[PDB]
Amino acid sequence: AQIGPVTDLHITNANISPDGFSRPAVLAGGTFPGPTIAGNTGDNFQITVFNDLTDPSMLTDTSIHWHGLFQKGTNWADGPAFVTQCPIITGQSFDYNFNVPGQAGTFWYHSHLSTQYCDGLRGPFVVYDPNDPNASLYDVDDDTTIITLADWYHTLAQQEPIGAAITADATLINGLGRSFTNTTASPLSVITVQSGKRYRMRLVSISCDPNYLFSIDGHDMTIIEVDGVNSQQLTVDQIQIFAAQRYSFVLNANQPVGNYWIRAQPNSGGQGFDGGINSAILRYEGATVEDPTTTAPTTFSNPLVETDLHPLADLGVPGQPFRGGADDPLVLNLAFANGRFSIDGVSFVPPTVPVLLQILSGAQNAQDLLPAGSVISLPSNSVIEVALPAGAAGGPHPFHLHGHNFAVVQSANNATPNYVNPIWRDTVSIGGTGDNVTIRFTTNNPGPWFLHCHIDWHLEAGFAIVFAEDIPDTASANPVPQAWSDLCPAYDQAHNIST
Ligand SMILES: *[C@@H]1O[C@H](CO)[C@@H](O[C@@H]2O[C@H](CO)[C@@H](O)[C@H](O)[C@H]2NC(C)=O)[C@H](O)[C@H]1NC(C)=O
Ligand SMILES: *[C@@H]1O[C@H](CO)[C@@H](O[C@@H]2O[C@H](CO)[C@@H](O)[C@H](O)[C@H]2NC(C)=O)[C@H](O)[C@H]1NC(C)=O
Ligand SMILES: [Cu+2]
Ligand SMILES: [Cu+2]
Ligand SMILES: [Cu+2]
Ligand SMILES: [Cu+2]
Ligand code: NA
């Protein structure tokens, strides 16, 4: 069952064995992935998060981010530790009380403390639209049509060297999959369809690192949503999905009744499908209960290419149709050396006082804010352009901006910008050497918004900056509840920190 929009959510430690290997984890709702949180567009969500964690090897503090939800007027509820809050300590709870005006689509939630979401705190978050313009394109859209793609590690996250190339031990599809080494024939996930029906498959990358080449043997996929943004219909036979991205696609159950492999090939870790790694099963009602015998093609003839995507609505692009054609045009210098990432010459290390609390206490320019050199102010009611030229080791890096979606004016592997009708999204691959992936948005949401690579190991190694958007209006726009004001005193007391 789905939970929400008003619900408790308990965060616990437990042993799980999603690939046949038992390890302890950090779980929401007792499962991996966590339960789906859901509601309708414009609803009030009140997710009371109970921190019941006791195992220090995965951190007993926590904080949860609602990925892709804009949090307008509720920056304090966004979740990134030391940007918008101090962590919740064990034995305490916190009500994330916010609204989702003007958004409908496929989202997710995850820990946003250190690398803790890798240890298991990740689940889907769906905001349905009762008047969805795409409703007539499918018959079925429910908890059974959500497909999560996850990397899973046998080593606990707090034992991963910072700045290292860290590699997973299994791909999990809907929480199940097989290990790359010492492979055992543990259970595979089954997605069940009825011949003749059309399904809104909600594909969610809950990855901490790899991108996946996703396909379904014998089937194609008609994209209708990208990171929350309705798209024109685009039919493809493969989707390369980077960490934290989402797509809705229509699956037409139009092939013979049978069993078909669902494939998710990561860019690192196990390559191929030997022993049923990187796999799940599409089963038609009436098919025999047995593994598929289908083949992938050698090459995919209609792969997703990001510049082929266009919004369903006339979203356009803000600003002027050339590089630098914005009120505030920025170019970030994105680098890696010696185990640490940097942006504009500064490696991100979380501050002691959350950025939002520094601003509410009266710090009102970006040079007064800590960490020094990690906070860039943005002016209000202005068109922002951010060029993100690739080259830093460990790519391709999927950059994500909180508080906003953005027009993708230039995509990976294509030097031509689009100032007319690019897709809008919230997490974008910045590509390869020589690329110049560029995003645009307008500043109508006061508060400090994190910008970072969504490979969680890279964020931990410093690949982040904070956009302090409209510092002068942050306090009036974001009134804070007493429970939020209580978080830093409690956290600092528990950890013997003075501030
Ligand atoms: C990516 O595009 C940005 C512009 O959006 C380029 O920025 C210019 O960089 C040159 C120096 O390299 C400066 O003289 C300009 O002031 C910058 N802004 C402009 C021209 O609008 C950046 O060089 C591009 N990077 C790559 C790798 O192609
Ligand atoms: C590279 O990106 C450009 C810009 O998004 C793509 O160019 C568009 O191509 C479409 C489809 O043919 C045309 O309708 C548009 O007028 C083009 N826009 C511009 C600004 O040129 C281009 O197709 C992409 N290249 C590849 C190989 O997909
Ligand atoms: Cu996220
Ligand atoms: Cu986010
Ligand atoms: Cu990265
Ligand atoms: Cu973030
Ligand atoms: Na425009």
UniProtKB/TrEMBL annotation:
One of its GO terms (molecular function) is copper ion binding. Cu(2+) 1 binds at residues 65, 400. Cu(2+) 2 binds at residues 67, 110, 454. The keyword Membrane does not apply. GO terms for biological process: lignin catabolic process. Its EC number is 1.10.3.2. It holds the Pfam family Cu-oxidase. It is an enzyme of class 1 (oxidoreductase). It catalyses: 4 hydroquinone + O2 = 4 benzosemiquinone + 2 H2O. Cu(2+) 3 binds at residues 112, 402, 452. InterPro entries: Cu-oxidase-like_N (IPR011707), Cu-oxidase_2nd (IPR001117), Cu-oxidase_C (IPR011706), Cu-oxidase_fam (IPR045087), Cu_oxidase_CS (IPR033138), Cupredoxin (IPR008972). Keywords: Copper, Disulfide bond, Glycoprotein, Lignin degradation, Metal-binding, Oxidoreductase, Repeat, Secreted, Signal. Disulfide bonds join 86-488, 118-208. Residues 11-131, 144-287, 349-470 form the Plastocyanin-like domain. Its cofactor is Cu cation. Cu(2+) 4 binds at residues 397, 453, 458. SUPFAM superfamilies: Cupredoxins. It is found in: Secreted. Its main location: secreted. Belongs to the multicopper oxidase family. This is laccase. It comes from Metuloidea murashkinskyi.
